[PDB]
Each structure stands twice: as C-alpha cells, then as structure tokens.
A = this chain, B = another copy of it.
C-alpha cells in the first residue's frame, strides 16, 4: 500500500522531468545526468511491456 504510494510520487516526479524543455533543462547543474536518466527510464518502461 505504502510502496504503491511512493512509486506513484516517484513516477509523478519523472513525469514532470519528462516535460522539462531542453532549454530549461540545460540551465540546471545536473543537466547532463538528468537527460541521461530520463532517457534510460523511457527505454526501460517500453522494454517492460510484453
């Protein structure tokens, strides 16, 4: 129950990150790694589909 609530908030943070435009993302000190990780999540979500 609680695990599910946490997963949902984590996914919500990831949804926000997905929608950050590149010109905004590039202003962040963590830009390179954030771009890498949001790309990795996108691929893993698709790979987990049957």
Binding site for B on A (CB under 8 A): 2-3, 5-7, 9-14, 16-17, 19-21, 24, 27-30, 33-34, 37-38, 40-41, 44-45, 47-48
**Which single member of B7, B14, B45 contacts A13 (CB below 8 Å)?**
B14
A43 → B minimal CB distance (Å): 9
Q: Which of A3, A9, A27, A38 has the most CB of B within 10 A?
A: A9
Q: Could you jot down 12 A-B contacts, CB within 8 Å?
A: A2-B44, A2-B47, A2-B48, A10-B13, A10-B14, A13-B38, A13-B41, A16-B37, A21-B29, A24-B28, A27-B28, A28-B28
Question: Is A44 a contact of B13 with CB atoms below 8 Å?
Answer: no
